[PDB]
Amino acid sequence: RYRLFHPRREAIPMHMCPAKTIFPLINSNNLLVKTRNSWEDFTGRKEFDEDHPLPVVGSRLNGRTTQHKWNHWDQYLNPQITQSIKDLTPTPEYVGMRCGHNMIKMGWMKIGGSWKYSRGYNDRRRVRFMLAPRVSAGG
Amino acid sequence: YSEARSNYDGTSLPAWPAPGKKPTYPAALSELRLPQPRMRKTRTEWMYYHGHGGCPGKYGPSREIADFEYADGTPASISGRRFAFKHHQDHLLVQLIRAAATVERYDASGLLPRIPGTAEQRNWDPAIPLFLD
Amino acid sequence: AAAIAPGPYRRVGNIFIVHCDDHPFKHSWEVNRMLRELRLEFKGQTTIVPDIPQVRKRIWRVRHIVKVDVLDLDEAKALIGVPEHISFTDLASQLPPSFG
Amino acid sequence: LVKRHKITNNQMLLMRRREPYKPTMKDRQEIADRAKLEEFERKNADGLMFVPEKALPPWQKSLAHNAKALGSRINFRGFRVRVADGQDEPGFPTPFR
């Protein structure tokens, strides 16, 4: 059966998350709140002991990373690093030469494909007053 | 070494009665109000009854007890998902507390009507008597 | 003693645990809006809400997608395990406002 | 094309409308029209204020100023030019009238 008749207090059990989790001192007439506000507030894993350091296991967010190319702040702070025309980079506002196509009804589409649903784009690529009177000959 | 907890405090209801005493048993029948249909509890209903939120991996010891521990007793680290689950439990607690506080504040202000239901429910359901006066 | 409780009387409210049991998106947008007001968007989601006329109106509107459980304030206090003298108003005032 | 979205559960696969709690197109038009009408009625709850010359739109301000230019340079009360582009008469008394 997919029609289960059980209390929703059972559906959401509060057995292993009592009030003491957030008000640890509640049982002793002390209303101190220590509640983990949001998942956003997570400083990261921390070793419990110095003898058991966490392993440095590569993740894709910190491993798939390229070498640092001096930015404007670094070159302004220490001019000794502006050692090449390559280091002489343009303003950061310049993303680069435009890629993709600004199709009318779909926005920016990759140059890869998906051209079937775009005809107004090609129409624009291939490139009331009568009811109002003239106040004077010269306008 | 190993751990087996059903409650946050680790306390558990007496499972084994005194010798020679007739042991207590759960309610095998579903919690349906009507006497019929007389259906036995499903496996998922038993999971709900025993504390797991319908699934083995949602709530209960299988979700709250660390899956490993160093041989010398040093505990495990706080994973991001572990912190997120703790935040979710705190969020459930906060929802409950805020709902209770809202009910109490409404009662104090005097907004909780003495009538059982709203106008729509009252004019839809005959079971609610007439409170005209 | 076969007589009315001889002492000061305190009013106690209720709290509704609302669980979504049917795909909310398969209904009309009014039902989905009421469910979202109840803070429900997917099947299998459970929320805790106060027993007030607005919440009752919403639950009445979406009673065919929602299964409801009741918990008096006393029952909720016992469930969370806090002293009876402490008030949910005090707990709410203590807990932070920028939680989620 | 159809805007594909990253899923977080099979419920999102079953979902057809990205925002189920949002009125359909016709109901959106109805609600927007009702809201705009209510806002317009709230704005017009008070009478039609007769704004001065300087507050008229750009295409009436200069015409009125030129019409009343002579009176501005020769100051004497009681001089009013009955221009045509001015604000239309409301038809009822108003607090600002």
């Binding site: 956003e40 400083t43 990261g44 | 991001g80 912190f83 | - | -």
Partner: peptide
């Protein structure tokens, strides 16, 4: 859409979660 977080949500991985090694006084 808008998220209510009424159900369990896995915290998103972010660079601020890097395990920072605590500064240690030199051995000399």
């Amino acid at each position: 859409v808008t998220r209510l977080y009424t159900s369990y949500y896995t915290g998103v991985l972010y660079p601020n979660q890097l395990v920072q090694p605590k500064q240690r006084l030199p051995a000399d």
